[PDB]
Amino acid sequence: ALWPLPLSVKMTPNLLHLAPENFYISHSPNSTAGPSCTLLEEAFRRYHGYIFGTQVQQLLVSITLQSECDAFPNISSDESYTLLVKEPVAVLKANRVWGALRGLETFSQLVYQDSYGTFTINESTIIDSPRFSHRGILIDTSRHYLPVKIILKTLDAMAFNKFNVLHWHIVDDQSFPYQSITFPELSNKGSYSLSHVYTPNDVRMVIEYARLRGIRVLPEFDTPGHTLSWGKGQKDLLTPCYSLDSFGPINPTLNTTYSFLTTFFKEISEVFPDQFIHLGGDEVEFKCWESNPKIQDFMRQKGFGTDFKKLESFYIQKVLDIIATINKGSIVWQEVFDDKAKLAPGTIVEVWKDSAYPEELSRVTASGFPVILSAPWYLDLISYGQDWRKYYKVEPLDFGGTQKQKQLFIGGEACLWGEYVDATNLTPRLWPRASAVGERLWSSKDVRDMDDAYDRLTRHRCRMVERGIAAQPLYAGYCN
Amino acid sequence: ALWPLPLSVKMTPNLLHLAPENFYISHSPNSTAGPSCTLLEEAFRRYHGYIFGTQVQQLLVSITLQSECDAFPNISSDESYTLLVKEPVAVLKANRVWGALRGLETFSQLVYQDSYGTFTINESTIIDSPRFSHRGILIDTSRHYLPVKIILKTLDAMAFNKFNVLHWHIVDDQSFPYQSITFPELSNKGSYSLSHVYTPNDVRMVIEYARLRGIRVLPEFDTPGHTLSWGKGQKDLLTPCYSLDSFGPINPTLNTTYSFLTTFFKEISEVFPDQFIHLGGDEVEFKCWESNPKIQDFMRQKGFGTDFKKLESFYIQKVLDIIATINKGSIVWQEVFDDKAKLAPGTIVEVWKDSAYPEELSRVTASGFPVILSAPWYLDLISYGQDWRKYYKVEPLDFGGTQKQKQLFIGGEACLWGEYVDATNLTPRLWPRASAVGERLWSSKDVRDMDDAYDRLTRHRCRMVERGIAAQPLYAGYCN
Ligand SMILES: *[C@@H]1O[C@H](CO)[C@@H](O[C@@H]2O[C@H](CO)[C@@H](O)[C@H](O)[C@H]2NC(C)=O)[C@H](O)[C@H]1NC(C)=O
Ligand SMILES: *[C@@H]1O[C@H](CO)[C@@H](O[C@@H]2O[C@H](CO)[C@@H](O)[C@H](O)[C@H]2NC(C)=O)[C@H](O)[C@H]1NC(C)=O
Ligand SMILES: CC(=O)N[C@H]1NC[C@H](CO)[C@H](O)[C@@H]1O
Ligand SMILES: CC(=O)N[C@H]1NC[C@H](CO)[C@H](O)[C@@H]1O
Numbered sequence: 015a016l017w018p019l020p021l022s023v024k025m026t027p028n029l030l031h032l033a034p035e036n037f038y039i040s041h042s043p044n045s046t047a048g049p050s051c052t053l054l055e056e057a058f059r060r061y062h063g064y065i066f067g068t069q070v071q072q073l074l075v076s077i078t079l080q081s082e083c084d085a086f087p088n089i090s091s092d093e094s095y096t097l098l099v100k101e102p103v104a105v106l107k108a109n110r111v112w113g114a115l116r117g118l119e120t121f122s123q124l125v126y127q128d129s130y131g132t133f134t135i136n137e138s139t140i141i142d143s144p145r146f147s148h149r150g151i152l153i154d155t156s157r158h159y160l161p162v163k164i165i166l167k168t169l170d171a172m173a174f175n176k177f178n179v180l181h182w183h184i185v186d187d188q189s190f191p192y193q194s195i196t197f198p199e200l201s202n203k204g205s206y207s208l209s210h211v212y213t214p215n216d217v218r219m220v221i222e223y224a225r226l227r228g229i230r231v232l233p234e235f236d237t238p239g240h241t242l243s244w245g246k247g248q249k250d251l252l253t254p255c256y257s258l259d260s261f262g263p264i265n266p267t268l269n270t271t272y273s274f275l276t277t278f279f280k281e282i283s284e285v286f287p288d289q290f291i292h293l294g295g296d297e298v299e300f301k302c303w304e305s306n307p308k309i310q311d312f313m314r315q316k317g318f319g320t321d322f323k324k325l326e327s328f329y330i331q332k333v334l335d336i337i338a339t340i341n342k343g344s345i346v347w348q349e350v351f352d353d354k355a356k357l358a359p360g361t362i363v364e365v366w367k368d369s370a371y372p373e374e375l376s377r378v379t380a381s382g383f384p385v386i387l388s389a390p391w392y393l394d395l396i397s398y399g400q401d402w403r404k405y406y407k408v409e410p411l412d413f414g415g416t417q418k419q420k421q422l423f424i425g426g427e428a429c430l431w432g433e434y435v436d437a438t439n440l441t442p443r444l445w446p447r448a449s450a451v452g453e454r455l456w457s458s459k460d461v462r463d464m465d466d467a468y469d470r471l472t473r474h475r476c477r478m479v480e481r482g483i484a485a486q487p488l489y490a491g492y493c494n
Numbered sequence: 495a496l497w498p499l500p501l502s503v504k505m506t507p508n509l510l511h512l513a514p515e516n517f518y519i520s521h522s523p524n525s526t527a528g529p530s531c532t533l534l535e536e537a538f539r540r541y542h543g544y545i546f547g548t549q550v551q552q553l554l555v556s557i558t559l560q561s562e563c564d565a566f567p568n569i570s571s572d573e574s575y576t577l578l579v580k581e582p583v584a585v586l587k588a589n590r591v592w593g594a595l596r597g598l599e600t601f602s603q604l605v606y607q608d609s610y611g612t613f614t615i616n617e618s619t620i621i622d623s624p625r626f627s628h629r630g631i632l633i634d635t636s637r638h639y640l641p642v643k644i645i646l647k648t649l650d651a652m653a654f655n656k657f658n659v660l661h662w663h664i665v666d667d668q669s670f671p672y673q674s675i676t677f678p679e680l681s682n683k684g685s686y687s688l689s690h691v692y693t694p695n696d697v698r699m700v701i702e703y704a705r706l707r708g709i710r711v712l713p714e715f716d717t718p719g720h721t722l723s724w725g726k727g728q729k730d731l732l733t734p735c736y737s738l739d740s741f742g743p744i745n746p747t748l749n750t751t752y753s754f755l756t757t758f759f760k761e762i763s764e765v766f767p768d769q770f771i772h773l774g775g776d777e778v779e780f781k782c783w784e785s786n787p788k789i790q791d792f793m794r795q796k797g798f799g800t801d802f803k804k805l806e807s808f809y810i811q812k813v814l815d816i817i818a819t820i821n822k823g824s825i826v827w828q829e830v831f832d833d834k835a836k837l838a839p840g841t842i843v844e845v846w847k848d849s850a851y852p853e854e855l856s857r858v859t860a861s862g863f864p865v866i867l868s869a870p871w872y873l874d875l876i877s878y879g880q881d882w883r884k885y886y887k888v889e890p891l892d893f894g895g896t897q898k899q900k901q902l903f904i905g906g907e908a909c910l911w912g913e914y915v916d917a918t919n920l921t922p923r924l925w926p927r928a929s930a931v932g933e934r935l936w937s938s939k940d941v942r943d944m945d946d947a948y949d950r951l952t953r954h955r956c957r958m959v960e961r962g963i964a965a966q967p968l969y970a971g972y973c974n
Contacts, residue, residue, distance in 0.1 A: 157970040188970045206972040398875045399914070434879070438964040439922035484918040490637040490668045492686040 016123050017449060017474035018176055018456035020142040030101050032125060032133040034066040039118075042076035042105065051083040053111055053226055061118045064481060065125050070135060071102040073121060079109045086287045087112055087178065087230050089424065094143035097121055099135055115228045116142065116176055123477070146410075148386055148425025149455040150179035150232070151448060153440075156186030156243065157432030159210035164437050166223050171445050171483045173227040175452040180224055181292065181427055183234045184212070190243035192217075192235075196281045197274075199247035217285060232345070233286045236294025237275070238264035238329050248274060253309065255302040262302025266329035267312040276336050283340040290362065293333055295355075296347035298326050327355040334358060345386070351378060362424070365389055372413035379419035387426040391451050393444060394431040400488060405450035406467060409459065426455055445485035446475045496603050497929060497954035498656055498936035500622040510581050512605060512613040514546040519598075522556035522585065531563040533591055533706055541598045544961060545605050550615060551582040553601060559589045566767045567592055567658065567710050569904065574623035577601055579615055595708045596622065596656055603957070626890075628866055628905025629935040630659035630712070631928060633920075636666030636723065637912030639690035644917050646703050651925050651963045653707040655932040660704055661772065661907055663714045664692070670723035672697075672715075676761045677754075679727035697765060712825070713766045716774025717755070718744035718809050728754060733789065735782040742782025746809035747792040756816050763820040770842065773813055775835075776827035778806050807835040814838060825866070831858060842904070845869055852893035859899035867906040871931050873924060874911040880968060885930035886947060889939065906935055925965035926955045 016023065039058040041047055047054050054075065077083075082091070095113035097120060098105045106121060108114040120142065125135045151172055153160065169180060184192050190204025191211050205211045212220075221231045237244075245252035245261050250270060252261040265271055282291060300322040303309045309325070318324040330350050337344045338358060345362040346355075352374075357363075363378045364386045365371055371389040378385045390408045405428070411420050428451040430444055449471060453461065468488065476493035478485040496503065519538040521527055527534050534555065557563075562571070575593035577600060578585045586601060588594040600622065605615045631652055633640065649660060664672050670684025671691050685691045692700075701711045717724075725732035725741050730750060732741040745751055762771060780802040783789045789805070798804040810830050817824045818838060825842040826835075832854075837843075843858045844866045845851055851869040858865045870888045885908070891900050908931040910924055929951060933941065948968065956973035958965040 158967060159972060189972075207974065209974075210972055395878045396876050397878070433970050434967055436967050438959065439919075439966040442919035442922065479918065486919040487638060487914055487916050490913050492639060492669075492690055494687065494689075 015126070015470055015473040015477070016120065017470050018453040019458075019461050019470065020120060020140045021458060022141040023138065024140075025136045025138040028137040029068075029134050030070045030099070030137060031068055032065070032070050032135060034133065036071065037062075037065075037073075038071075039073045039075065042074040045076045045081075046079065047075075047077040047081040047083055047111065051081060051111070053083050054081075054114065056226055057115055057118055061122050064122045066133065067480070069101060070099065070104050073104045073106060075114050075118075076105060076107045077109070077111060077114060078107065082110045082112065086225055087228050088289050089147050089230075091147070091178075091228070093147075093176075093178070093228070095120075096142070097138075097140040099124065099138045099140075101137075112228045113143075115173070119174060119176065123474075144176070144456045145458060146423070146425035146455050148179055148427070149177050149452065150181045150386070150388075150425070150427030151177050151444070152181040152183055152388070152427050152429040152431070154183045154186065154430065154432030154435070155191055155212070156183065156189045158436035159189065159191050159206055160440065161437060162212070162216050162219065164440060165220055167441065167483065168444070169220075169224050169227055169229055170481070171441070171478060171485075172229055174478060174481065174483070175445075175449050176456050177448070177452055178228055179230045179232050179425075179427065180220075181232045181234060181429075182220075183236070183431075185235060185243060186240045186432075187242035190247070194278070194281060196277055197248065200244060201247070203246035204243040214285070221287065230288050231286060232288055232290055232292055233282060234292035234294055234345075235278075235282060236292075236296065237333065238266060238326065239296065239298040240294060253302050253306055256305040256307075258301065263298050264329070265309070266325060266332075267309055272332055272336070275333060279333075279336050280340055283342050290343045290345050291337055292345040292364070293330070293337065293350075294347055295326075295330055295350035296366070298349065300326075323353040326350075326353055330355045334361065348374060348378070351381075351383070357383065360384070362386055364427070366392075366429070368392070375410075375413040375423065376415050376419065379415055379422040382422070384422050384424050386424060388429050391426065391428045392431070393428050393447050394433065394435065396443065402447050402450040402471070402488060403464065403467075405447060406454060406464075407462070408451075408454055410454070411459070426451065428452075441484045442486040445478055445483055446471060446488065449474060449485075495606070495950055495953040495957070496600065497950050498933040499938075499941050499950065500600060500620045501938060502621040503618065504620075505616045505618040508617040509548075509614050510550045510579070510617060511548055512545070512550050512615060514613065516551065517542075517545075517553075518551075519553045519555065522554040525556045525561075526559065527555075527557040527561040527563055527591065531561060531591070533563050534561075534594065536706055537595055537598055541602050544602045546613065547960070549581060550579065550584050553584045553586060555594050555598075556585060556587045557589070557591060557594060558587065562590045562592065566705055567708050568769050569627050569710075571627070571658075571708070573627075573656075573658070573708070575600075576622070577618075577620040579604065579618045579620075581617075592708045593623075595653070599654060599656065603954075624656070624936045625938060626903070626905035626935050628659055628907070629657050629932065630661045630866070630868075630905070630907030631657050631924070632661040632663055632868070632907050632909040632911070634663045634666065634910065634912030634915070635671055635692070636663065636669045638916035639669065639671050639686055640920065641917060642692070642696050642699065644920060645700055647921065647963065648924070649700075649704050649707055649709055650961070651921070651958060651965075652709055654958060654961065654963070655925075655929050656936050657928070657932055658708055659710045659712050659905075659907065660700075661712045661714060661909075662700075663716070663911075665715060665723060666720045666912075667722035670727070674758070674761060676757055677728065680724060681727070683726035684723040694765070701767065710768050711766060712768055712770055712772055713762060714772035714774055714825075715758075715762060716772075716776065717813065718746060718806065719776065719778040720774060733782050733786055736785040736787075738781065743778050744809070745789070746805060746812075747789055752812055752816070755813060759813075759816050760820055763822050770823045770825050771817055772825040772844070773810070773817065773830075774827055775806075775810055775830035776846070778829065780806075803833040806830075806833055810835045814841065828854060828858070831861075831863070837863065840864070842866055844907070846872075846909070848872070855890075855893040855903065856895050856899065859895055859902040862902070864902050864904050866904060868909050871906065871908045872911070873908050873927050874913065874915065876923065882927050882930040882951070882968060883944065883947075885927060886934060886944075887942070888931075888934055890934070891939070906931065908932075921964045922966040925958055925963055926951060926968065929954060929965075
């Protein structure tokens with residue numbers, strides 16, 4: 015009942031037992047980590063609880079290289095491990111802490127209770143490492159505020175599924191819950207209410223809780239579109255519309271805009287330790303810019319004519335430069351690439367439009383840019399039946415291109431946009447549909463047997479329910 | 495913020511206040527009901543909690559006719575009431591207890607807290623009665639078992655929405671959780687497990703909890719198809735298949751079948767006090783009957799040829815006769831009608847197939863039968879976005895027919911089939927999508943303004959959340 019299915023699993027028929035109050039998870043004497051390693055100590059304790067809730071007496075955890083116990087994970091973090099289940103001492107070996115975390119999850123999925131309640135595990139050898147290094151979940155806390163507790167629950171479910179990136183789409187048009195220290199008015203005026211806000215301490219808590227599970231927190235502060243809430247607190251930032259709505263995208267002709275964004279993103283570079291910041295750039299509406307006389311004047315001032323993609327490009331290039339100056343990397347939705355913005359090498363492009371996405375993947379990678387796929391995994395787009403199968407059947411590298419282009423494909427994300435999602439329905443909608451994407455992103459390309467996937471996923475889903483994650487059914491049946 | 499919108503609402507600008515520990519709901523001196531009326535006493539207490547959780551000091555409740563306080567509701571129950579909100583004593587007047595229950599819900603929807611927390615209500619006069627008398631929710635406890643507590647929660651949400659029928663699709667192919675007293679093996683062998691069973695006391699609890707809210711419990715024991723679980727405990731009931739699956743529909747050639755069904759339905763007539771029993775009759779598969787030599791012999795014995803609709807008709811007519819003999823009424827899915835079964839006058843037909851349903855409604859009613867519509871309200875068939883609007887826009891009487899035929903349309907049901915639904919996701923999936931159907935079935939035909947519906951429904955949904963029903967969002971926003 016392994017999910018995702020490990021790269022290599024070899025088992026024997028020899029059954030071994032475990033005794034809950036005489037089973038300890040501890041550091042191997044040769045490990046680079048010890049009791050000082052909070053991340054491993056906390057993992058040992060919570061996995062002991064998950065496991066239980068001829069005798070294998072102990073699980074020894076050996077970290078081989080500098081452990082990275084006090085660091086934040088990044089795109090290059092080594093999540094490989096091996097697990098040797100035998101008596102009297104099983105061994106989990108990993109280059110780094112990140113792999114040991116993954117291996118503790120796998121170990122917990124191997125232990126089961128027989129018909130008489132006896133805790134049991136098969137002698138086995140597992141070798142495992144992920145197919146892709148970027149394995150994300152997008153949550154949207156603007157369309158609806160999500161209490162910190164459900165973000166923490168989502169992070170727990172992510173760990174059970176070996177997801178390693180929380181793409182936090184923190185702000186958008188409808189609300190601005192991010193409490194900024196340098197700009198207090200953004201949240202004071204842009205939040206749904208003063209109790210629908212993420213304080214600096216809420217953000218640190220999420221980041222740290224994520225870190226303890228090997229999960230990166232990727233912040234998205236989408237501009238120049240998707241910024242209506244920003245205008246409440248930052249005066250003169252948005253373009254006033256002459257006519258359809260009242261305010262449009264951020265005004266890219268003003269120096270106060272770039273001055274504001276410089277101070278703002280500098281704060282973000284300090285709050286969020288991840289190497290990458292997602293700058294957004296999706297669905298920018300030009301009508302408001304088109305209808306504005308001052309923008310029209312700016313357009314002719316540098317020969318952009320009536321091509322507002324050049325103005326969007328001009329804007330996004332200035333933001334990308336601000337990010338590079340503060341030594342962070344940038345991620346961008348595909349529109350930025352499609353509208354001909356000049357992107358510096360290393361800029362990641364997230365391909366989200368479902369129309370000819372394989373052809374988009376070829377173009378991005380042929381231009382030399384790293385790419386992330388979310389297009390066929392828009393989990394907010396619900397439908398009747400077993401749609402997990404359609405997410406599962408995606409083979410992300412089925413696009414035209416050389417091996418060099420295929421090496422630029424670094425992973426993907428399951429996206430849960432928030433228009434129709436809040437605390438009442440997030441979890442059942444997310445899980446186990448996102449588990450399908452999790453396996454496609456972790457396991458080998460040839461892991462695609464549908465019957466076996468259904469068998470393992472129904473049990474994995476029951477395991478999620480047992481651990482307090484209200485994952486919905488795949489089909490008729492029951493748990494226990 | 496009324497939902498469903500009452501027939502007639504007239505308000506003044508005069509605001510009146512309420513004091514939580516000096517506001518009592520009590521029986522008017524002329525009422526036919528008093529302290530002995532458990533149904534009203536319990537309603538007074540729970541509505542006091544819902545309300546609070548120049549002064550109107552008291553809400554007097556006057557029942558005009560024999561109250562029916564100790565009875566079960568039926569299709570003809572009078573749910574009309576008037577509500578006069580004034581100082582110092584507001585008055586709720588109703589012919590029967592059923593209307594007072596509806597009026598207590600409406601009264602609770604009129605009370606609100608101003609910006610300073612002051613409990614407030616407008617002086618007003620409401621006259622109200624339902625457009626249709628059958629307003630149902632179908633739950634499916636076979637595809638997944640539902641704990642009694644979530645059935646009780648569903649009944650609470652039903653009351654908030656003025657639904658009055660719980661269509662309990664209790665058994666089906668996948669499991670038989672109904673614990674039968676006369677046939678203990680049905681559940682012992684057919685349930686998912688022994689802890690996934692509705693005991694006689696569970697069933698009484700549901701029925702009584704429903705009664706206290708003016709809700710009828712309509713049991714469905716679907717035959718001859720949808721009976722795989724029945725065969726585990728009742729040997730020789732199902733037809734053995736020669737070849738696609740193992741067992742097919744109930745065997746209608748054996749006297750042991752009708753003997754079993756006679757004893758079985760007699761027990762059902764005693765357990766479920768509602769006048770109607772839903773006999774099902776949907777999706778009967780003939781291949782198994784076609785492949786069976788003994789059935790083939792029976793087919794030629796009375797000249798049915800190769801027309802298995804005649805065998806289905808023969809079977810269903812014998813069951814309908816068993817129900818009539820025990821003095822209950824029958825409800826049947828449309829297939830029974832479409833396949834030319836001879837139905838006695840009074841048999842209700844439930845139109846569920848989405849293909850040309852208006853033409854089905856004309857045929858059924860032209861044949862003189864009462865009809866219930868569920869076709870466009872299959873809430874298990876989820877999709878992206880505001881699908882509440884499509885359920886809301888249905889005008890059920892838009893079919894061809896005379897006024898006599900239109901008087902045979904007695905109501906409808908929102909159906910939540912269970913293939914993909916259990917305790918983890920039932921409530922958010924059900925509510926507030928079912929609220930759309932609730933208004934269409936309660937309120938006037940001309941109540942269709944979409945903007946006003948969205949305004950009242952987002953607030954009604956927030957009210958459901960406040961009362962512990964985890965109803966999902968309609969769109970971006972927040973509650974409180
Ligand atoms: C883990 O160990 C068990 C017990 O040996 C394996 O189970 C059985 O396999 C044997 C022979 O392969 C059969 O004779 C038994 O009927 C199986 N079950 C029982 C009750 O012992 C199981 O296959 C092992 N897991 C794997 C995948 O290697
Ligand atoms: C219930 O009473 C209130 C208070 O009188 C009504 O509210 C206002 O309507 C008056 C005139 O119609 C306006 O001057 C106010 O601006 C409104 N609000 C406030 C703050 O008083 C309300 O309309 C009444 N409800 C209905 C539908 O009759
Ligand atoms: C990058 C992106 O996806 N932008 C938007 N596109 C549609 C989504 C709903 O499916 C959300 O509205 C989201 O904000
Ligand atoms: C009357 C009826 O609806 N029969 C079936 N039809 C399809 C449903 C799923 O949408 C359920 O399987 C249900 O049992």
